[PDB]
Paper text:
Members of arrestin family play a central role in the regulation of signaling and trafficking of G protein-coupled receptors (GPCRs). The multistep process involves a rapid phosphorylation of the receptor protein followed by high affinity binding of arrestin that sterically blocks the interaction between receptor and G-protein, leading to the signal termination. Visual arrestin-1 (arr-1) is proposed to exist in basal or inactive form that gets activated upon interaction with light-activated, phosphorylated rhodopsin (P-Rh*). Thus, an intact polar core and the three-element interactions are the constraints that keep arrestin in its inactive state.
Here, residues R175 and D296 form the central salt bridge in the polar core and charge reversal of these residues results in arrestins that bind to the non-phosphorylated, activated receptor. [name] crystallized in space group P212121, with one molecule per asymmetric unit. The structure was solved by molecular replacement method as described in methods, which could be refined up to 2.7 Å resolution. Residues 1–10 (N-terminus), 69–75 (loop V-VI or finger loop) and 361–404 (C-terminal residues including the C-tail) could not be traced in the electron density maps and thus are likely to be disordered. R175 forms a central salt bridge, restrained by D296 and D30. The hydrogen bond network in the polar core collapses in [name], where all the hydrogen bonds with residue E175 are broken, increasing the side chain B-factor by ∼50%. Superposition of [name] on arr-1 shows that the gate loop is pushed away from the central residue 175 of the polar core (Cα R/E 175E – Cα D303 distance is 10.6 Å and 12.2 Å in arr-1 and [name], respectively). Interestingly, the side chain of R29 is disordered in [name] as it could not be traced in the electron density map beyond the Cβ position. Compared to arr-1, [name] shows a 7.5° rotation. Crystallization of [name] was performed without any ligand. The structure of [name] presented here is the first structure report of an arrestin with mutation in the polar core that shows a completely disrupted hydrogen bond network in the polar core, a 7.5° rotation between N- and C- domains, and a ‘free’ C-tail.
Author numbering: 11 to 68, 76 to 360
Amino acid sequence: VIFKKISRDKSVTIYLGKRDYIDHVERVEPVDGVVLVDPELVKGKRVYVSLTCAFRYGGLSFRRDLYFSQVQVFPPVGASGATTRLQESLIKKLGANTYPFLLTFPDYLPCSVMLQPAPQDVGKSCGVDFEIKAFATHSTDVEEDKIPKKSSVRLLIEKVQHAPRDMGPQPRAEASWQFFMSDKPLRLAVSLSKEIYYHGEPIPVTVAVTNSTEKTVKKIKVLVEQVTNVVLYSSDYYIKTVAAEEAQEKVPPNSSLTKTLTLVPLLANNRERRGIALDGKIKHEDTNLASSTIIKEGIDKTVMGILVSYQIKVKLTVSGLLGELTSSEVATEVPFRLMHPQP
């Protein structure tokens, strides 16, 4: 759906073909668009188009430009390169005051992520925004580099994480426990079907409990936890359960059990959207859980602003022996990556 935005003084209008731009690790879809100007109003002026990736935190406020690119589209510079089908269409259709622009993403950026704090959280609101801006600027004998608000337009865009071609090794885990006063172990092996999952895709967690203890494994709980780490400006940490299933089955003393439970991590699983890393405005409707942060090798993690990750957590609730006051709970975790399907 081709969408446009006109400036207040109607001098600079900007057209884009889409709002979501696909990052699939291998490459990122460039921002190809067009700018229709009113030659009467932009006469003697210059019109630029900019791409900005900013991390914001927060009145108290912090902002870091994770990436910035800018080009002049009027008057023309003559170095635009080959035009795309969308650009050619829009130019041939809108008239002659139409000037194409192409703004590429680098490979060291994160994707669109927003985070609003919950009452039990000490962190402030933060996120990563992507913004395209077309503006007209000019100088005079009294002022230079004057950019009036009326001669400019902004468009918020999305940068969406999609699965790359390859994929990590099969997620596996193994934890063993020896409790107080007994060298008898409780072993727990956990495997996932694959290392990358898609938003909405069922996640098969295979759980193998080898219980050599005199204790009873009263409960087997499997969660999908979203761990999020703000890594710029303030060191905030969040961890929320976004999916949960129990086994409805126990493991008696000196017993073994292997079962498969299927978790689907969805934002719709909890009405509470706060304290969770999302991929859009916390009140919109197509907002999903943020995709796993894919940190490219050699890059310093802090330039991602917000690190998002997902893990399967297997919790075992074991019974107390004679003399013990309460039950006990042990747990293990196995990481995995969540994102949108391949292009």
